[PDB]
Amino acid sequence: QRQFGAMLQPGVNKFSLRMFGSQKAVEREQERVKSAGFWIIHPYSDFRFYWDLTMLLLMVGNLIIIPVGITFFKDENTTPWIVFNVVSDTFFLIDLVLNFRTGIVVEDNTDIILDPRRIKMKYLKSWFVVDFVSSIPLRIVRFTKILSLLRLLRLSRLIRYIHQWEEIFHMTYDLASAVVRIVNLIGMMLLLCHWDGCLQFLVPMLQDFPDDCWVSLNNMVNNSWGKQYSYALFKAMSHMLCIGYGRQAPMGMSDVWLTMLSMIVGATCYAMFIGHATALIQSLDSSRRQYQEKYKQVEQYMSFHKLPPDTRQRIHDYYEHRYQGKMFDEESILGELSEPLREEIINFNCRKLVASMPLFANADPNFVTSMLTKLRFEVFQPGDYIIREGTIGKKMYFIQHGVVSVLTKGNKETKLADGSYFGEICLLTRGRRTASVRADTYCRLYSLSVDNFNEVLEEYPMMRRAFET
Amino acid sequence: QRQFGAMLQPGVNKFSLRMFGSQKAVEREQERVKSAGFWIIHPYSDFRFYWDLTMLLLMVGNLIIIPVGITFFKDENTTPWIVFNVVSDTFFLIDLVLNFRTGIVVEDNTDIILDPRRIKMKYLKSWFVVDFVSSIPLRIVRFTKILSLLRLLRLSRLIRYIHQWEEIFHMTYDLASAVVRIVNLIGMMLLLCHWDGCLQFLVPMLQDFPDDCWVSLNNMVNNSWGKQYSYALFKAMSHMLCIGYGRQAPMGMSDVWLTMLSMIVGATCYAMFIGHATALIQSLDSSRRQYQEKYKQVEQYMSFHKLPPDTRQRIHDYYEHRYQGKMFDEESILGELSEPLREEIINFNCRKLVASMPLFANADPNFVTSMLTKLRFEVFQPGDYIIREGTIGKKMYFIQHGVVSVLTKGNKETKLADGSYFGEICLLTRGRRTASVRADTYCRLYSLSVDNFNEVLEEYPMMRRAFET
Amino acid sequence: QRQFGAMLQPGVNKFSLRMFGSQKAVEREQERVKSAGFWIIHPYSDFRFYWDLTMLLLMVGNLIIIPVGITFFKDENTTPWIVFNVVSDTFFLIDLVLNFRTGIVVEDNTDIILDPRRIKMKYLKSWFVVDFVSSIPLRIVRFTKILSLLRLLRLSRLIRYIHQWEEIFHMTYDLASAVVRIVNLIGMMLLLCHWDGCLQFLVPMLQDFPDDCWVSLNNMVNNSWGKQYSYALFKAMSHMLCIGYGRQAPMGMSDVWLTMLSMIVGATCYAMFIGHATALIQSLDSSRRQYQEKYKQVEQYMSFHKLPPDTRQRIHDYYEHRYQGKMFDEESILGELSEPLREEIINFNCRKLVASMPLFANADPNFVTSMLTKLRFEVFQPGDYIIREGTIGKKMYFIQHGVVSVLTKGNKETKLADGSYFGEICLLTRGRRTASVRADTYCRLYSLSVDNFNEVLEEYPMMRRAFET
Amino acid sequence: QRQFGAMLQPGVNKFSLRMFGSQKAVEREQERVKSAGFWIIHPYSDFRFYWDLTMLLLMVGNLIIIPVGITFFKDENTTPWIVFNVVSDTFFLIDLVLNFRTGIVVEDNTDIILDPRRIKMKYLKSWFVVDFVSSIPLRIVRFTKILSLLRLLRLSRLIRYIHQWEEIFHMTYDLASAVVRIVNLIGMMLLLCHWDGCLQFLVPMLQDFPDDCWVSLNNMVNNSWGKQYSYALFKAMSHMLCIGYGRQAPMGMSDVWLTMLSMIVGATCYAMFIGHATALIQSLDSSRRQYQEKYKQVEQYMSFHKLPPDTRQRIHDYYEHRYQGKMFDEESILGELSEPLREEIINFNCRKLVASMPLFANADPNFVTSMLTKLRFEVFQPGDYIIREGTIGKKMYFIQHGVVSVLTKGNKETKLADGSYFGEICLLTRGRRTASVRADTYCRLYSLSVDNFNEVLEEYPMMRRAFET
Questions:
Q1: Closest by alpha carbon to A446, among A340, A357, A375?
Q2: Is D421 annotated as a binding residue?
Q3: Is C324 at the interface with chain D, CB within 8 A?
Q4: Nearest in space to D397 (alpha carbons), one of D382, D389, D409, D385
Q5: Neighboring chains of A (3 or more beta-carbon pairs < 8 A)
């Protein structure tokens, strides 16, 4: 009660700011959960996180410790074992009454913390039967046996909790988290091998070590419980990895049928793990694969029409100088974003260089921020004539990179670079072009067509009337 | 004839309601099949289903029982065998005359049950030659041998029936049916191993057990027919799983060539099964993989233009708060649906909150149900200015979730939440905005633009005339 | 010269009609090739086909026969061998002068047969150097050795010819041709195993059988050339399939390094074959996989908005009753076809039922064949109100299947089926609907909207003027 | 200083012309780097390339030589070893001061060479800590040990340099570079096997060869360092390839745990390499796979509507005569190109045949070069009526290939081929067509619709006014 209540709120500094955005919303959420019910626990809290971590580190320890103690220890020595059982049972029993006061995430953004009445109404018909049935520690003797067998369904519980924490933590991978995921799956396969090896030692022990089993043939009848277990894990690992039998082929019928069961189960589990890990690795470089497919389609197109190899080389260069080996499309990406995001990106890219035009300075910021929505991004190669003489002028350009040489008859050479705006005369009248610019380097330009500018100027009458004046 | 005729109709309570929709159509279909022909059987019936199940459980039993009796039983004891043969032959013969009176599914919705004349006209040139040829029980002696060999083509028959029932049952998978499909394929591979093991015992038996074969080397010459068969299945399973030879490498030429045939066939069959099962598992989470690819393309786009890490973090959050880790698109989905479905979904999402606007109450339901077709669904983040001062008003918003704080100069703070409609003034006149709202939580809004509302109001003149008045 | 000239033309009855379309074009092509040059051979002929088949069946026989005769026959007995060599050499030499008079397929439709001058101009700088260099049968002695080694580059020649015939034969697979392709690749892998096994017998023979090799350990020193070769193929097959060593692990350094080379090469070749065969099998059911992905996206969409389970069940049924478990899109398919194809398909689907409208009979066929371009195909479920009272009429419908019950106040029930056109009154005036039809079965309808009909009637003034009158 | 300064510039004749385009830009870039800083080195130079190649060929030699000298040489004979160490250390130390004067590629096109101040500002917080820490040659003794261990992090350095050179060299694959990539990955896996085999000899050597290890069992205790190493590589290769244990199963606990570690690591590494190589091979024929999927969707569409087999055969032919077995789309490809590229391709395809029209000769080149943007490419089959009598004329055609027979009532037969323009009369007036042409071969036509021509003629008033006159 001293420091305990403060751990009930969503206090994660890094996790909750990522999930809620603003600290005012985080403080507000804590106040709402505190003021709402009798005394409730939030599922974005530090306390729920450490409690779930303790439950996972208990269940993994049970899954390791149980099948070694079933078959390997000749002397039961129940005392320490029964103490271990009771601690796990009281942890599940403390948890059973804890999972009735926690908010349930109906949606990722906001969850409901109204009262335990709603929470129990979902929790009952959601999982209460299997959780309570596994949670408790000749009909009565049969129930004792059934209760022992039923408590095995707890495993499923960890699966739900892992999946909840994993998804709310990390859902779009990078290289490092993919490596962590692969190491987790290799640990799970090793756990399956551990259970399998204990079973393959257990079954010849229940028949009291006949002469056909592998324990009697290998002279490992009486030896240290570490050596027997290690050899059993080896045999189960070799059946999984399909590198062979442990030492000799099965010679008794119990060993033959156990080996066939272990072979089928282990080989199917391994070769279905590795396909998942291969898809997990190959899902990192998806953009480069999309670029290669697009280039293959372009290559087929050039082969269909029999272009000369000069044109094909130019097309190959142009693509390598635009997508840069990775495929994307700004159009759909800027159409999927909301309005302040698409405002900020367009503003950051083009605001500084578009404010340098002296016709753009004194205008209202609404006018220029509506003009910012019509800029097209283009790439020109060395030697391409952007403008040619006698052509009707239709769009203007702003340099974003590169150098551009202007060719005039009188003035024999003129250079522009570092973001230079040209072809500006086409915005105020219609007629033939008077010069011709040529790219000298791979120049990225931002284009503004006259049709789009005309529509914007029509939309703001005061701007258009000022232009008339 | 007592209860028999009622089983001829499509009486499945769960299956036929799924297939036909309305019970009036189910009763009508049964009446039509009953009244149409002489005496016909429907292929959506209970009777056809149990008959096909009995045929499958007979053919699987034949496929298991035949190659054990060919090679393993030293004493033929034909009597019980010949009785078993005759029961299978009369089942195929009862079936041969049954498959002339069943409706044929030309299409999934409705099938034709007009007369046996049409059914025989398809059935003859469709499968009657192979079905009748397998269906019957020195030229005459050669025919006896050919008839024995030909009856083997019946296997194909089960393939057609399984495929028909499987497809008309379940065609879009979940996790559980995928697990059932994988267990079925493992059973088929085990069947192939069973045939292979019986063959590998049969071929050294026909040469009367020479000293080079594996039966004579392993001292399994005279032993129980269970031990020999089990070891043979083991050897065939080890050749399939490629974990090694059964015990020692082949030492005779018959064993060498049999082992090479079994190796090639088994390894190709296994490694072509496992690729199918991997694709079957990976086809469950397709939406999450589509989301990861879209995010990778977005990441490449942010790297191409060198945005600051603040903007990149906002873009990462915005996507995690919109698609929720799974990729979809409402546009094409609502364009692929028919008219009452797309009516019902739009009505359920927006009808309750759009009826709260006091301008929407007294209007005709045609007007509001045509207004319901222009609502766009948007997501705004904490801190994003939805409206800013001095901006021309162009769309209104209805809260579907979250809180929104209105900022006014005089009234220092105003809150809206639980589905609150604001920016309503822009529908009735054009001019600068007078306040500025700011999101406080991740708010889902439904937007209605003035252009769409203007088009609707033009379409209903009486509504527009009422607005004028 | 008697029957010989007639085999020079493209005489394939099945292949050339598939490739050229019309028999007049086939006769014309033969006349053009006959009349064009001195005396030329067409590469769509029967003669070129049988000649290429003979060349392939010679080169495969050489690839099998050579490495058995290099290492297995103790007595060279050159005589028959040298005769075999000379027949293969004169076949390549007859072919060298034959590949100067055959037309070259610059494009699949029409090839050039103008003169040998153009053909030699491509053939020289295309492949003449490697073909002629492999085609011929101390510097002179070194050349004899180099000529022996160079003639090995002929293998490549078969690769070009196989690829040409395979592609011009079959390029879009079915199940059977996929099975043929897989059997071909298994034959190629068996060929590689054959060469590998002969090498693994050759290398311990060149050292004159030391005590560490597998031939001396297994006591196969002097034995029949069939037994040695069979065991060598077995060892190479076990190294490829990775099922183990042939019998014992390598004990000499020559065997160790040979086994490591054979292991790496064989395992990489096998596991790169099987991925190709898995992709080849999985490329048959692509439409069903596209349907499953679309359904998964739809399921995510229904989960995002929390619809009741009634609506979700209706959406699940509607999709299963429209795409029928396989995904396609008529739009892009009918936009990719040329004009007589898209004319024929639309005409076959809708001409018979659209001619039954008595307003459509007496009109010009241009008018109705332009009306045929505006029909939309829809599917309605049991219980969906197609029309409701008081709604403004906007489109008419033609039944293509199913029954539809019309509900009127006076006339209590009216049925339509077998292709019945209703809602026809909306084409001639605007106003509220007067009845309401309801689907009783899963009915496929063809819809015609008033906007499209109005545009067509405007396009034909005489039709529109007749309607006015 | 004599020839040394000239190697500092981007002097690659083949690489730098590919990267910069024009030789004037290459000369200009060299002048800019020379004139800019104190004395700097460009990362597109010959010198940087040879220096990085020398560094890679040193680090690979270190990775091979180190773990043979750790465990295999009984006599240390430090002298030559310590000399080898010092040469590698002084190479890393010469490099440490060299990587402070090289330009850093912020973008692929142009990099910054302004001053070492910016370069050090990126290089410090980018990699200077790990590079300098690995670059140098009881706390002091512990540091000596830590320095030995830390210098192992240099490996990473080669990974960055390889990735930079690989990407700036080759990014879209062909067959040959894919084969080179696969051979590189097999070399990397062999390197891992080399380290693994040295470890499996090292661990039984540190325990001074007990009787359970494989070295003592196989009698390889004292033998040549080539035989021991070769057998160790064999055992590591067999654990990777999962073909079995080297000779006998592990019999001591050290061997058992080493074999389990080596099994898991090697099998996971191999089966994750082979999936990458399979995806790398299958990414070459992507266009043919896209064509097969499109054809499967078309086949489903023909099966949904029950067309006769004549129509299906025509659809199958038409597709095989248009995409030619490989899938592409000109639309998006010509929409992704910049303006001079899309000018050049359209001009090369259609300029020569469109200039033959005598109405197109005397016009201004702007008019025809704007007409060139409206040509649609179509394919017609034998027997398809392109025009039929009594139909309103709407588009004209230019032959690009094939023969076309014109049918007239008076003139009984008229042929056109070799690029013949017909239907020209529809451009100057509206009315019924007067003849009907029929394709005789698979003819590729270029179509020009009247609507597009009318829009162009409206755009150029002088052309339209001339047509009026």
A1: A375
A2: no
A3: yes
A4: D385
A5: B, D
